[PDB]
Design an enzyme around this catalytic site. Structure first.
Site, PDB file in Angstrom:
ATOM      1  N   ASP A  77      34.351  42.973  47.306  1.00  0.00           N
ATOM      2  CA  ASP A  77      33.127  42.925  48.199  1.00  0.00           C
ATOM      3  C   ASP A  77      33.379  43.839  49.352  1.00  0.00           C
ATOM      4  O   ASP A  77      32.371  43.838  50.351  1.00  0.00           O
ATOM      5  CB  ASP A  77      32.882  41.405  48.555  1.00  0.00           C
ATOM      6  CG  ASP A  77      33.854  40.804  49.086  1.00  0.00           C
ATOM      7  OD1 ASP A  77      34.759  41.092  50.181  1.00  0.00           O
ATOM      8  OD2 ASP A  77      34.589  39.793  48.724  1.00  0.00           O
ATOM      9  N   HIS A 108      39.705  50.116  44.631  1.00  0.00           N
ATOM     10  CA  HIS A 108      40.065  48.563  44.634  1.00  0.00           C
ATOM     11  C   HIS A 108      41.327  48.498  44.467  1.00  0.00           C
ATOM     12  O   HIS A 108      42.503  48.958  43.973  1.00  0.00           O
ATOM     13  CB  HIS A 108      39.371  48.262  43.062  1.00  0.00           C
ATOM     14  CG  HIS A 108      39.000  46.847  42.650  1.00  0.00           C
ATOM     15  ND1 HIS A 108      39.999  45.615  43.223  1.00  0.00           N
ATOM     16  CD2 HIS A 108      37.812  46.322  42.368  1.00  0.00           C
ATOM     17  CE1 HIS A 108      39.227  44.439  42.937  1.00  0.00           C
ATOM     18  NE2 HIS A 108      37.931  44.930  42.221  1.00  0.00           N
ATOM     19  N   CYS A 142      38.831  43.856  49.829  1.00  0.00           N
ATOM     20  CA  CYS A 142      39.690  43.642  48.811  1.00  0.00           C
ATOM     21  C   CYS A 142      41.171  43.714  49.171  1.00  0.00           C
ATOM     22  O   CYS A 142      42.216  42.952  48.443  1.00  0.00           O
ATOM     23  CB  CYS A 142      39.358  44.392  47.308  1.00  0.00           C
ATOM     24  SG  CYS A 142      39.331  46.186  47.844  1.00  0.00           S
TER      25      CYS A 142
END
Lengths: 312, 323
Positions: free
Chosen positions: B96, B223, B99
């Site tokens: 979101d 990520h 991370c």
């Protein structure tokens, strides 16, 4: 949004401890007596007070836990919470998969629903393996009061109680509730608009039974539990036994029917509640008695409170 | 069938942790960086998924593990290439925009940073503590990779704004300098493994005041995830290799934001802030005689009161008997 859709999800570990304990509490005696719960039958859920929150948030809670629809219907038919001297009951959501009687009954006392089919499988086991003669005779006699093959009609009621697929499971009639209350050794009171009434565990002496009732509500073909709200003001914790026409007392025999009023005083804790000045009988309800080890409500509450600070 | 994250196994327990986290932050008056008193020393380890029917082992991995990002780092010979060290597993992490925080939060507590506690701490530190040294380090690292002397100040003030919780992905994603500040807030070094990658040492603190086991993150796409150890049933050493093996020879991991004097004593700094050990490897001759540096990792130290993994496990075991 924020809050989870059922009590159990507040602490899935705890939920399992309960689901694991339930089967181990069932006794299944050798001498022919009905299978029954040793201890867990004495437990009772109470809902937390949703009164102290901003109504934008109070609705967020009610949306998750409460069956707003079925409560409205029973209130609008002046059958639930009509008396202002007794405490308010709230209807909890119940999965309508065909086993809602069991789900609602399971929820009333533990917070968990009957997803593992423990109560369902117990009802069926009892009907296949215990002495059903007396149950059948009671059902014939009740069914007569309301060319037919009785033995066939009965053997079908037994098949329905099974877990076999016919709604994923068969729905259950009034005789099943009567057998269920004897397995629990605890009376069941159903509130509705012929299921409604009082189911007493007459295969047991009242000295061997828990004398606080499980309170279900019924509308459509749907059961839910009617749980009290926790420890609040000075109204009495009790359910009125009259809607004044008295509630039906299912499956009595004729001698029992003569002493009906003495039986309610035996198996329930009856009290006189005054009503506009007439006095009506009413049964005392249980205080919340689930110990911390298996208390899901206490967990959901601490979760709600924390999510409320985040919201404020 | 099993729930999709550790925290959902016991949401009450999850909150006890989320409530404890802000109370552990000590925001001092004299200009020192805000830091955690105690909770920074905790460390998650995953349960042994070895003892199950592989039809069911996959059902677990599907829920908890980020199978995609683990494969990618294994397939690029960056994660679990050494057979002497224990296997790391990548946990799923909400992408979101926060991370880094989610993964870091998960590494040590099991909970993700849904309450923005670590995120809000990173930003608070950048608004209220002495940023001068951080900025100089970032300029110096950024220079090594012309630029106007009013444009650094603008580029910096923007990095601070990004760390805020304001909506710009629901939150802004974070650069390398944020990881460096985060490791100083925790007083614990952070090692990131990727194809960002490297070692972040809490240099604003003396090593005597830091926890000398690292948080291990993994990074791919944009990520972050935590790389948690797998915990027992085998005799391998609990440690992360501080060198990568591209093309036969060993390149050391980058050590971010050092100054020139620190850069000279780089190897002495790793020995200061981490617990370094020699793990041996077989080379082209002379025995199996070559040694690589590696940092010791922490044994699982979360007490039952706040241990979500123990709960998920008891849940899995019960759902396995049912299966």
């Amino acid at each position: 949004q924020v809050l989870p859709q059922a009590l159990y999800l507040s602490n899935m570990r705890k939920a399992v401890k309960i689901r694991e304990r339930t089967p181990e509490d069932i006794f299944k005696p050798t001498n022919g007596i009905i299978h029954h719960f040793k201890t867990m039958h004495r437990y009772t859920l109470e809902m937390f007070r949703t009164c102290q929150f901003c109504p934008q948030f109070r609705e967020i809670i009610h949306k998750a836990l409460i069956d707003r629809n079925i409560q409205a219907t029973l209130e609008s038919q002046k059958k639930l919470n009509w008396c202002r001297e007794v405490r308010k009951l709230v209807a909890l959501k119940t999965n309508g998969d065909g086993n809602c009687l069991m789900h609602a009954t399971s929820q009333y006392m533990w917070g968990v629903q009957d997803t593992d089919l423990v109560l369902r499988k117990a009802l069926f086991s009892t009907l296949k393996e215990t002495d059903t003669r007396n149950f059948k005779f009671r059902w014939q006699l009740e069914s007569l009061k309301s060319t037919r093959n009785w033995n066939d009609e009965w053997d079908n009621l037994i098949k329905m109680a099974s877990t076999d697929t016919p709604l994923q499971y068969n729905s259950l009639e009034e005789i099943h509730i009567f057998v269920l209350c004897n397995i629990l050794r605890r009376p069941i009171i159903v509130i509705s608009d012929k299921v409604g009434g009082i189911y007493l565990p007459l295969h047991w002496p009242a000295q061997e039974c828990y004398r606080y009732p499980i309170v279900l509500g019924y509308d459509s073909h749907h059961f839910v539990p009617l749980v009290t709200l926790k420890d609040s003001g000075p109204e009495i914790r009790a359910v009125p036994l009259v809607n004044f026409e008295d509630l039906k007392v299912h499956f009595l025999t004729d001698p029992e029917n003569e002493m009906k009023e003495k039986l309610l005083k035996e198996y329930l804790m009856v009290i006189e509640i005054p009503v506009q000045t007439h006095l009506i009988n009413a049964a005392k309800l249980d205080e919340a008695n689930l110990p911390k080890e298996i208390n899901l409500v206490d967990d959901y509450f601490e979760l709600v409170q924390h999510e409320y600070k985040k919201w404020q």
